């Protein structure tokens, strides 16, 4: 109520910017702020409060602030030498932004549901999730973002999506990631080298995310199947060959013509470093396949499953023999061959 005075407006606005919660935002206070803005104009201490009220109630206020600039004055108070005293006494974008769910939920409602009339559980807000214990206490009930891509760079949401196995979430993530990989590629569907290091950083983030969850996404597999025949072998060798290692377990006869034919055609005509890199990638792929197969026996049978890895081992052995014949018996390649056979 003290916002009517023009002398106490900024300090009271700064105080309300800290004392504001969700149960305090109400339509008549929104109208009060609107008439104050109409009477005084564009004030930063009012713009910040309006942005906060919009964040707490997006279905009543629409504000798009331009830029972060200093809204509240950072004037050191008269107790700065006392603030330091009490401190020394107490010594001893490609990826979408994180936002709440769309306000279209419960948009058209005639009456209040039977759940909230009886004060049941409900759900847990997304802005309150800031630490690990808060995730532990509310792991079974969580609020999903409006855009699933924002989950890619959040550990607390990765821990949740590690064990969900939901169809709509997987479909949304698949569509978003597939479109992003298709539009951001450097040699597929467009000649745009302007991206450059951006695509490399995106691939590094994807690889770091898929090292967690101990599995890979289907969008990466589709992108690999699409963009492999057009690859040259030097643009993003590291990230590409690391993405190749996270391929789901399947029969060798089906996955051979899509990946291994092009891999061999690029292998038999490249340098020795490419050979060592693809040998390392194949070793990592075999390790991942064995790790994922070792857990299924504790739960096509195993007879048809061992044939695939046997054919893979024979194929990589043939590759190694031909490469040793081609490279004139170089020990730098024999080291990688023996490293693979060690595993």
């Amino acid at each position: 109520a003290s916002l009517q005075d023009d002398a106490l407006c900024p300090y009271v606005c700064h105080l309300l910017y800290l004392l504001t919660k969700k149960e305090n935002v109400k339509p008549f206070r929104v109208r009060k702020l609107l008439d104050l803005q109409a009477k005084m104009g564009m004030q930063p201490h009012l713009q910040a409060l309006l942005s906060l009220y919009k964040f707490f109630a997006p279905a009543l206020i629409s504000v798009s602030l331009p830029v972060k600039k200093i809204y509240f004055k950072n004037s050191e108070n008269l107790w700065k030498t006392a603030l330091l005293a009490v401190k020394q006494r107490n010594r001893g974008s490609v990826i979408p932004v994180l936002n709440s769910s769309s306000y279209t939920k419960e948009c058209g409602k005639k009456e209040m549901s039977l759940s909230d009339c009886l004060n049941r559980s409900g759900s847990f807000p997304l802005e309150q999730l800031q630490s690990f214990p808060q995730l532990l206490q509310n792991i079974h009930c969580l609020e999903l973002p409006s855009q699933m891509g924002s989950v890619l760079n959040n550990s607390l949401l990765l821990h949740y999506i590690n064990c969900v196995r939901d169809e709509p979430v997987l479909l949304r993530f698949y569509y978003w990631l597939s479109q992003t990989l298709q539009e951001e590629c450097i040699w597929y569907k467009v000649n745009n080298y302007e991206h450059g290091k951006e695509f490399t950083n995106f691939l590094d983030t994807i690889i770091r995310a898929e090292c967690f969850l101990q599995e890979g996404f289907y969008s990466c597999e589709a992108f690999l199947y699409k963009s492999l025949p057009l690859w040259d072998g030097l643009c993003c060798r590291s990230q590409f060959l690391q993405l190749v290692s996270w391929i789901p377990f399947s029969s060798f006869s089906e996955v051979k013509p899509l990946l291994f034919d092009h891999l061999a055609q690029l292998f038999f005509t490249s340098t020795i470093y490419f050979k060592c890199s693809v040998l390392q990638s194949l070793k990592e792929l075999l390790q991942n396949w064995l790790l994922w197969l070792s857990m299924d026996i504790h739960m096509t049978t195993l007879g048809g499953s061992m044939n695939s890895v046997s054919k893979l081992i024979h194929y990589v052995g043939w590759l190694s023999t031909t490469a040793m014949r081609l490279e004139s018996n170089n020990t730098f390649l024999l080291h990688f061959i023996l490293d693979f056979y060690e595993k």
Binding site: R237, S238, L241, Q242, T271, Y273, C276, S277, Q280
Partner: peptide, 12 residues
């Protein structure tokens, strides 16, 4: 890593 090292050996 090993792949980045192979890359930087290829560049030289």
């Amino acid at each position: 890593g090993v792949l980045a090292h192979l890359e930087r050996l290829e560049t030289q």
